[PDB]
Amino acid sequence: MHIKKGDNVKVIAGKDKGKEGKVIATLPKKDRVVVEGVNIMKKHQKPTQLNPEGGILETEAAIHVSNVQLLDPKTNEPTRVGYKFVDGKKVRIAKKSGEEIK
Amino acid sequence: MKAKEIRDLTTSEIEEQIKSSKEELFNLRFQLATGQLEETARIRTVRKTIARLKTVAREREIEQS
């Protein structure tokens, strides 16, 4: 996927449209990503499980990867990504500024 | 153990390594049966090591011909 674990991304679709966060996990086989503070779900946790204390746990649920967009390193605007070859190595380039992302 | 180290080894050394790996695998299976094996991934690791040793030995006895 064009998004990678550790990237700083902007949500462009969903309830959290406009939020920014860090990509903390990816699911390549589902085309999904997990972004901090985004898509919070309240799951009913049984205290009877291996964890003694239970209740309602709040955690990020995965979002479809086409709903997050990389932020331009210079302008901090959402941008699509291209690829260059520098000394035979692929480099991700922001299509708005042309700068290397990572 | 990987194929590069195995290829560094000599044929007699490969045979001895196969013997010791088989003994280790057997001991692991016995521990698993008696319920004393927590590190279950060791079984697969040793099995694949044995497979690699045999693969290299077969390569050598093929290139000899």
């Binding site: - | 695998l25 057997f26 299976r29 016995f30 698993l32 049966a33 008696t34 319920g35």
Partner: protein, 89 residues
């Protein structure tokens, strides 16, 4: 090939009683004979084997959900030691 002849020890109430009598129970390769089992035991555990009894167990029907199948057939040997002992633990 001894380590292939012997597959695993059998740990059950009946097997523990046998162990009290100096009889050790193993699941063995379904193709081997009593003599091969004796030789494998003597090679692996450095004991002297007094005798070997052996028996076969049919595949047993087993169910999981809507899927019907069978367990593997088994060959089980009971090795009576003449000299020495085997520690399975």
């Amino acid at each position: 090939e001894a380590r292939d002849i012997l597959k695993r020890p059998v740990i059950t109430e009946k097997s523990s009683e046998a162990m009290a009598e100096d009889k050790y129970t193993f699941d063995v390769d379904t193709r081997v004979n009593k003599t091969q089992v004796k030789m494998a035991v003597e090679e692996i555990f450095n004991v002297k084997v007094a005798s070997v009894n052996i028996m076969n167990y049919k595949p047993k029907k087993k169910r999981m959900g809507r899927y019907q199948g069978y367990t593997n057939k088994r060959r089980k040997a009971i090795v009576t030691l003449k000299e020495g002992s085997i520690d399975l633990f």
